[PDB]
Amino acid sequence: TLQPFTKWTGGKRQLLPVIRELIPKTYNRYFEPFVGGGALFFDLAPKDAVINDFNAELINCYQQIKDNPQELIEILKVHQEYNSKEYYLDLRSADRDERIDMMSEVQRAARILYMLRVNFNGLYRVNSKNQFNVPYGRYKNPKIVDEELISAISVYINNNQLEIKVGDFEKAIVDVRTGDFVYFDPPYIPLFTSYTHEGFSFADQVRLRDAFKRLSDTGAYVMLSNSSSALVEELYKDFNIHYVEGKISEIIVTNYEK
Ligand SMILES: C[S@@+](CC[C@H](N)C(=O)[O-])C[C@H]1O[C@@H](n2cnc3c(N)ncnc32)[C@H](O)[C@@H]1O
Numbered sequence: 001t002l003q004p005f006t007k008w009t010g011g012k013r014q015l016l017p018v019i020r021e022l023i024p025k026t027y028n029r030y031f032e033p034f035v036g037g038g039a040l041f042f043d044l045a046p047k048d049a050v051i052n053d054f055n056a057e058l059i060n061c062y063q064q065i066k067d068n069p070q071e072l073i074e075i076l077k078v079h080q081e082y083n084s085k086e087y088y089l090d091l092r093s094a095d096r097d098e099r100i101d102m103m104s105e106v107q108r109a110a111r112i113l114y115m116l117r118v119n120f121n122g123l124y125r126v127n128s129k130n131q132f133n134v135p136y137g138r139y140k141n142p143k144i145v146d147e148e149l150i151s152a153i154s155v156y157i158n159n160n161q162l163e164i165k166v167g168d169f170e171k172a173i174v175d176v177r178t179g180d181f182v183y184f185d186p187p188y189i190p191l192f193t194s195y196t197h198e199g200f201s202f203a204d205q206v207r208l209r210d211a212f213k214r215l216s217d218t219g220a221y222v223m224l225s226n227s228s229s230a231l232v233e234e235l236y237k238d239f240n241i242h243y244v245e246g247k248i249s250e251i252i253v254t255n256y257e258k
């Protein structure tokens with residue numbers, strides 16, 4: 001049935017079996033503050049939820065699937081027919097010459113979705129000027145539009161209760177009440193040593209932990225994914241730390257034992 005409409009860095013599809021076995025048995029509303037591709041969100045298909053991400057282009061994708069599914073599919077079908085390296089390169093440069101400012105939100109959504117489907121590794125990346133800088137891919141699937149899926153996600157969103165937010169995670173959890181369930185999947189701590197990053201800092205990791213604690217002290221179930229780093233071990237030392245994969249690939253923290 002439902003699943004992510006796009007590939008995304010840190011996507012949790014493969015981890016679903018483990019997560020499904022650790023989610024609380026009963027809860028109220030659902031929250032996913034670093035939504036990304038939404039693997040869990042779409043797997044749960046909550047009737048009342050709250051999703052958020054700092055990346056504005058990604059959220060626009062969610063908003064347009066909800067609001068203009070038909071037009072989105074039409075445009076995607078056009079990109080599909082004219083697909084070529086040359087085509088890709090000219091559409092990509094739109095964010096370097098003000099054309100991007102003249103494009104509608106739905107047109108912008110179609111542009112990014114198309115690019116991710118045909119570029120190198122389906123990677124989302126921009127340069128210091130916020131311009132997309134990923135090259136064209138090789139031997140990719142010529143089928144890049146999934147019509148029924150988009151239509152389905154749209155129907156679902158429009159028939160339920162969903163709050164779509166853009167901005168910092170902290171702002172997206174203000175309405176948390178006792179019994180709600182929140183799943184956090186922030187950018188992982190790199191494997192003390194200072195580190196370069198895309199945006200989330202260790203200082204932020206601290207802030208996040210503080211927020212985790214606050215929510216726990218209020219009566220909500222919280223889940224958090226991160227790397228198997230010692231810092232992670234020290235940080236949530238007061239909680240139920242789960243280890244995943246022998247060589248231990250990653251960690252999942254909970255404020256409970258169901
Ligand atoms: C690790 S990925 C989420 C992956 C998602 N679990 C999956 O299933 O597709 C982390 C997300 O955090 C978002 N993010 C980064 N900094 C943030 C911040 N300060 N507040 C909220 N979201 C943030 C990133 O844009 C990225 O989408």
Ligand SMILES: [Hg+2]
Nearest residue numbers: 057058061112
């Ligand atoms: Hg996107």
